[PDB]
Design an enzyme around this catalytic site. Structure first.
Site, PDB file in Angstrom:
ATOM      1  N   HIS A  40      -6.675  35.322  -3.290  1.00 37.07           N
ATOM      2  CA  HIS A  40      -7.512  34.137  -2.774  1.00 37.07           C
ATOM      3  C   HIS A  40      -8.276  34.573  -1.384  1.00 37.07           C
ATOM      4  O   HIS A  40      -7.981  35.302  -0.636  1.00 37.07           O
ATOM      5  CB  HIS A  40      -6.158  33.079  -2.260  1.00 37.07           C
ATOM      6  CG  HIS A  40      -5.790  32.333  -3.540  1.00 37.07           C
ATOM      7  ND1 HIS A  40      -4.348  32.482  -3.804  1.00 37.07           N
ATOM      8  CD2 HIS A  40      -6.204  31.613  -4.541  1.00 37.07           C
ATOM      9  CE1 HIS A  40      -4.093  31.676  -4.757  1.00 37.07           C
ATOM     10  NE2 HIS A  40      -5.246  31.414  -5.293  1.00 37.07           N
TER      11      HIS A  40
ATOM     12  N   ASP B 203       0.977  -1.259   0.097  1.00 36.30           N
ATOM     13  CA  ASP B 203      -0.142  -0.163  -0.097  1.00 36.30           C
ATOM     14  C   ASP B 203       0.694   1.357  -0.135  1.00 36.30           C
ATOM     15  O   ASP B 203       1.879   1.170   0.945  1.00 36.30           O
ATOM     16  CB  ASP B 203      -0.860  -0.048   1.203  1.00 36.30           C
ATOM     17  CG  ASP B 203      -1.860   1.431   1.378  1.00 36.30           C
ATOM     18  OD1 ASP B 203      -2.224   1.793   0.226  1.00 36.30           O
ATOM     19  OD2 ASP B 203      -1.815   1.660   2.363  1.00 36.30           O
TER      20      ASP B 203
END
Length: 1176
Positions: free
Chosen positions: A724, A10
């Site tokens: 932003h 994984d």
DNA sequence: GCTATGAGTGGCCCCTGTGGAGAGAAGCCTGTCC
DNA sequence: GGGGCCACTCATAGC
RNA sequence: GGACAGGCUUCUCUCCACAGGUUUUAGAGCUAGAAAUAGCAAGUUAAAAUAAGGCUAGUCCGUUAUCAACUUGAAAAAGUGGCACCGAGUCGGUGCUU
């Protein structure tokens, strides 16, 4: 007997799981030899574990800081050039003036010349500061007055203008004396100036200063009359946000207005002051963030006026006027790059002559054209099929023809009486191209049916297959060239194909008008002046994917045709690009195979780096590969049968796919139509213009800014700003929803903060109107409502971001193919790769379903064993799918195993030397000097160096006033800044720190997260020179994990109602497990954590809340494992009770510990006893 | 009777805002092929 | 997020 | 599975610039009082540095990436560690072999 085995893996951004299984799904256990001086000669461990490491970091910060360094260096260079010009005349009046300027930063004692910099005497300095409170007053004095001033004042004015020359955002000249808009824009830059002067900016600043003074006096009088008690707070307390802080302290203007507003309402006669406060204009400083809008041409005009005025007295000024003007105006073009002499990896400039580059001779030395060509080419990709050939521009005429013919290649037409759909002939395709593609910028199916089949081929009804309502390819370049040149036969002549392609390449490469004019000057003999000028304005961007040599460069040896020749007409075959390159009847495939450069293969590191993605996933790949190699080494160099990897990608609904596929222009039209506004009616726009983000955001705003109620100007978007909603420091998000266009000064005023409350209140109605229009996302609404929701929070700052899931995908198949390369290499008798190892890809949904179906839940907050368990399950599922009681019992036994290998990868710390802030002077030895000769006591400096790593030292230190030698044994922290000196000669560095008689052989390199073991199995990891982290892992029986999972989602279970009730009954019956969990946590804490106060607080809180609902019990207890988690201690909230972090602030105990060095998997261990080293 | 000191605990601090130029990759969606 | 830093307090060792 | 073609979304790399902020010093603080201190006056600007520095001496480079330990290596790199069974609280025991 070679035991057959498989490996499960994984991969995440921070974890890499590894698992070894046999064909019976049992995990083998092996005895491993142990090296070192400890008694433990052999250790048995299971073949399962997971590796944890620090996330990789991008290079954005490094690039930004490099750019900043270059700007600072060049600004210093410009000042040096001005001083070089002035030196001859300045020496005649004051030889020491420049030295006084250079050393002005030093204290009185260290200065060599007189302390007052400007004049070197108190009287003239005081008189100058009285006459000219600000440099702008001096500037206006020099501009308007006609008398000869002192040379030193002229130097100060010129230097001040040069060092703050301002932006170059606007091209050309911006001097009003088109004139009307020029004057309007000047009024935009500087507001209200009655007197006509050549230096309007100085007048505006002086007016601002005088308004400041008048308002200050009035406010002083009013406060002293009406609020005697608060006068001292406002005018003396620098720690607050009052006027004293706004001047002497670090208080920002916004905070000053916030602090001053309520007091103004409390007093009378403050109307005008409040009105100015609403305009952010009260008591405003001069050196402020609003000046970022000032174009450089204003400073240029003031400079030129002063030089013109004073050139009558100093001839050298008149001679060097152009030099000085160019110093202010000159900048290195962006395509040129840094002017490096070969010794720089970021540079690409080609230098004509080995002279030193100066701003006055830049043209004669730098090859602009070649430099631009190298700049553009070195970033473009090479053709995959022909590695040694550059790809063509995406607007190439030949490339457009290729696209058109390839799309027309498979068009099948059905007419009346035709049994099967038919392919178009070469003559038919040529006629179609000439009739429609060279006449219409876009061709639809209806247009084709009406114009070619019905008119030319005279077919009344035609059926077309393979094309949906329009052909994707378009001859836009051909249309533009027809519009400009207006000579169709020139375009149709094949002898002009080379010339036309050269023209297109020139238009794609260069964006400066001068370079384009220079290159086209060779072909100016074929076109008039007007045509030549028109071509200079056309620009193209982008590149294709196939080379000229591939399409029309290589010819089939049998027919002499190129691929394009085949596509135009190939008889009944009608073979496309893919068919031709895969055709075995032609030599093209042989050319492809021969062009495959079997060059020196990229190293594993280089091969990983060449992939496109975050370097973090690169680091993950490298770690996974090394894990695989070491696991192979463990099993006797026998290759594993199967390898299983996992990706967590989750599919998305198709209708979202089509609604994204719809061009943004159409959806903007729909939003405006729902609104009914006329902005598109006044200003129609095309989609390729929407391709730019600036104009697209402007249209989304509907010409109205969210932050300020003001009308946007279409020609001013370049000067406008986008900020932003969430600042970059809190979280990085360049998504369109976070991006919002905003007025410049309003943007720069709001920094490191969410939008304020009152702005949200006043624009809330307009935001709801936009949301009904759907022109705005709900996510962006959520960003705009952070002030109502509570602003930024610590919890939202750090979390499992979606971007990591994106990084996991097909870069996972990239690491898969990398493993495939190494595992299977043997070629068979037919030179075919013998796949002895299979690469398996499985989606996380399968394993999640397997977990849910069979009660193998995982809870991340408990420990790190979940990565290893997921890898094991991945391997089991993969092997089963390629291929019950015994298997299920084996799975339960494996998942219950207490021994799991968890290793933290040791890393040497690198990066910035320390915190970037500079602190005031103070009497401490922990400050670091900013310069070699600048005493930190008298100048202050940086703080808190980051320790690169720690080293163990055994020596004697002269301790006490008696200077007596004492044998000592401790950990010394090496700063990153001192790493070079220490590694150059450790003995010298240790002697400098005061250690004497150092035993060199006992020096042990201890990086961060180095592991130490203590009695009773208690473990610690070395976090730094003086702080440790918890190193032990809590093993919990699986039944408790299952119970906690069930209780956590008690009302959120996703299953059949009978199963939900059964799980509810199981939770109800086993309520006593909670006390067992608490008791086990208590035992683990008392054994390895040693947090008696925190443990007692938690226990007391538990019995107090013993009667709470079970679900809240589970939510709180799951949070409780953060106490025992691996890593640095963290604070957590248990019901309403908050627990501070327990930090291990002393490292003396590990000096008598057992040091462990672990391999990349930890299967190999080397243990060294520190008690026997440096014995007293 | 005085001083140096090690040892611990609690709370606070962490440089920032942007403009312009280009190039590239990766996810989807449509169409065609191997 | 997490390591560094400072004010504060105490308990002990040595003289 | 792959490639080209059109649309949208997300991110990565390189370069050129701006405005600040911070830091020290200069801008004679006055009066009464031994001083503690109290009253008053003033407050906007300026210079320099902006990762220590390095030699390759450039109007360049200095925060990405790489790294368990031992041997051979300037580095890259190469080499360096038995098996089977019964068990399981961070791994133990049992039997063969060197």
């Amino acid at each position: 007997m070679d035991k057959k085995y498989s490996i499960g893996l994984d991969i995440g951004t921070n974890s890499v799981g590894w698992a070894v299984i046999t064909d019976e799904y049992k995990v083998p256990s092996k005895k491993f030899k142990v090296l070192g001086n400890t008694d433990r000669h052999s250790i048995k461990k299971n073949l399962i574990g997971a590796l944890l490491f620090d996330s990789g970091e991008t290079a954005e910060a490094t690039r930004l800081k490099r750019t900043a360094r270059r700007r600072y260096t060049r600004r210093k260079n410009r000042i040096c050039y001005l001083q070089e010009i002035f030196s001859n005349e300045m020496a005649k009046v004051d030889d020491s003036f420049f030295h006084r300027l250079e050393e002005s930063f030093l204290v009185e004692e260290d200065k060599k010349h007189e302390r007052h910099p400007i004049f070197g005497n108190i009287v003239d300095e005081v008189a100058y500061h009285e006459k000219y409170p600000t440099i702008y007053h001096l500037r206006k004095k020099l501009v308007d007055s006609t008398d000869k001033a002192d040379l030193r004042l002229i130097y100060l004015a010129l230097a001040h203008m040069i060092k703050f020359r301002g932006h170059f955002l606007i091209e050309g000249d911006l001097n009003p004396d088109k004139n009307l808009s020029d004057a309007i824009l000047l009024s935009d830059i500087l507001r209200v100036n009655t007197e006509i002067t050549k230096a309007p900016l100085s007048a505006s600043m002086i007016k601002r200063y005088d308004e400041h003074h008048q308002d200050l006096t009035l406010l002083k009088a009013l406060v002293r009359q009406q609020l005697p008690e608060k006068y001292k707070e406002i005018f003396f307390d620098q720690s607050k946000n009052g006027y004293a802080g706004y001047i002497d302290g670090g208080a920002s203007q916004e905070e000053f207005y916030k602090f001053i507003k309520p007091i103004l309402e409390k007093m009378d006669g403050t109307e005008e002051l409040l009105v100015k406060l609403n305009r952010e204009d009260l008591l405003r400083k001069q050196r402020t963030f609003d000046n970022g809008s000032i174009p450089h041409q204003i400073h240029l005009g003031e400079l030129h006026a002063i030089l013109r005025r004073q050139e009558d007295f100093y001839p050298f000024l008149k001679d060097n006027r152009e030099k000085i003007e160019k110093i202010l105006t000159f900048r290195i073009p962006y395509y040129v790059g840094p002017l490096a002499r070969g010794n720089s990896r970021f540079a690409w400039m080609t230098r004509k002559s080995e002279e030193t580059i100066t701003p006055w001779n830049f043209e004669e030395v730098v090859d602009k054209g070649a430099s631009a060509q190298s700049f553009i080419e070195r970033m473009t990709n090479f053709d995959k099929n022909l590695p040694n050939e550059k790809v063509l521009p995406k607007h190439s005429l030949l490339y457009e023809y290729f696209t058109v013919y390839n799309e027309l290649t498979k068009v099948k037409y059905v007419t009346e009486g035709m049994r099967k759909p038919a392919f178009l002939s070469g003559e038919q395709k040529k006629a179609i191209v000439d009739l429609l593609f060279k006449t219409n910028r876009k061709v639809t199916v209806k247009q084709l049916k009406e114009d070619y089949f019905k008119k030319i081929e005279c077919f009344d009804s035609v059926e077309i297959s393979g094309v949906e309502d329009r052909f994707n390819a378009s001859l836009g370049t051909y249309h533009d060239l027809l519009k400009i040149i207006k000579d169709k036969d020139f375009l149709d002549n094949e002898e002009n194909e080379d010339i036309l392609e050269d023209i297109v390449l020139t238009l794609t490469l260069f964006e400066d008008r001068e370079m384009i004019e220079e290159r086209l000057k060779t072909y100016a003999h074929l076109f008039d002046d007007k045509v030549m000028k028109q071509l200079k304005r056309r620009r193209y961007t982008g590149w294709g994917r196939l080379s000229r040599k591939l399409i029309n460069g290589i010819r089939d040896k049998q027919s002499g045709k190129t691929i394009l020749d085949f596509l135009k007409s190939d008889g009944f075959a009608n073979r496309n690009f893919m068919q031709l390159i895969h055709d075995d009847s032609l030599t093209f495939k042989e050319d492809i195979q021969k062009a495959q450069v079997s060059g020196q293969g990229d190293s594993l590191h280089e091969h990983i780096a060449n992939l496109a993605g975050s370097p973090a996933i690169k680091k993950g790949i490298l770690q996974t590969v090394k894990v695989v190699d070491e696991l192979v080494k463990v099993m006797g160099r026998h290759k594993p049968e199967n390898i299983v990897i996992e990706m967590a990608r989750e599919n998305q609904t198709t209708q979202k796919g089509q609604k994204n596929s719809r061009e943004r222009m159409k959806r903007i039209e729909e939003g405006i139509k729902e609104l009914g506004s006329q902005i598109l009616k006044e200003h129609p726009v095309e989609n390729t213009q929407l391709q730019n983000e600036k104009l697209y955001l402007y249209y989304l705003q509907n010409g109205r800014d969210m932050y300020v109620d003001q009308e946007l100007d279409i020609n001013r978007l370049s000067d406008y700003d986008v900020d932003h909603i969430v600042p970059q420091s809190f979280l990085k998000d360049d998504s369109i929803d976070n991006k919002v266009l905003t007025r410049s000064d309003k943007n720069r005023g709001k920094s490191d903060n969410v939008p304020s409350e009152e702005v949200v209140k006043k624009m809330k109605n307009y935001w709801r109107q936009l949301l009904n229009a759907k022109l705005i996302t709900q996510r962006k609404f959520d960003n705009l409502t952070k002030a109502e929701r509570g602003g930024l929070s610590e919890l939202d700052k750090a979390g499992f971001i979606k971007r990591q899931l994106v990084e996991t995908r097909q870069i996972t198949k990239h690491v898969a193919q990398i493993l495939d390369s190494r595992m299977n290499t043997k070629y068979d008798e037919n030179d075919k790769l013998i796949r002895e190892v299979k690469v398996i890809t499985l989606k996380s949904k399968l394993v999640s379903d397997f977990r849910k179906d069979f009660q193998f839940y995982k809870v991340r907050e408990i420990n790190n064993y979940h990565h290893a368990h997921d890898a094991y399950l991945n391997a089991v599922v993969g092997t089963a799918l390629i291929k019950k009681g015994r298997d299920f019992a084996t799975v339960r036994k494996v998942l219950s195993m207490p021994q799991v290998n968890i290793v933290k990868k040791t890393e040497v710390q690198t990066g910035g030397f320390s915190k970037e802030s500079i602190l005031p002077k103070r009497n401490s030895d922990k400050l670091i000097a900013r310069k070699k000769d600048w005493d930190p006591k008298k100048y202050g400096g940086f703080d808190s160096p980051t320790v690169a790593y720690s080293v163990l030292v055994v020596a004697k230190v002269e301790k006490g006033k008696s200077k007596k030698l004492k044998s000592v044994k401790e950990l010394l922290g090496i700063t990153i800044m001192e790493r070079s000196s220490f590694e150059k000669n450790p003995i010298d560095f240790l002697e400098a720190k005061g250690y004497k008689e150092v035993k060199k052989d006992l020096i042990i390199k201890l990086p961060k997260y180095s592991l130490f073991e203590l009695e009773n199995g208690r473990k610690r990891m070395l976090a730094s020179a003086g702080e440790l982290q918890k190193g032990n892992e809590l093993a919990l029986p699986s039944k408790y994990v299952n119970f906690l999972y069930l209780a956590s989602h008690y009302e959120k279970l996703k299953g059949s109602p009978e199963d939900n009730e059964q799980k509810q009954l199981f939770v109800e019956q086993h309520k006593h497990y909670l006390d067992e969990i608490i008791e086990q946590i208590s035992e683990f804490s008392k054994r390895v954590i040693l947090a008696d106060a925190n443990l007692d607080k938690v226990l007391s809180a538990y019995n107090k809340h013993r009667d709470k609902p079970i679900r809240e019990q589970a939510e709180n207890i799951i949070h409780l494992f953060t106490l025992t988690n691996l890593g640095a201690p963290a604070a957590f909230k248990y019901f309403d009770t908050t627990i501070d972090r327990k930090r291990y602030t002393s490292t003396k105990e590990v000096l008598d510990a057992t040091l462990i060095h672990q391999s990349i998997t930890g299967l190999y261990e080397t243990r060294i006893d520190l008690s026997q080293l440096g014995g007293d």
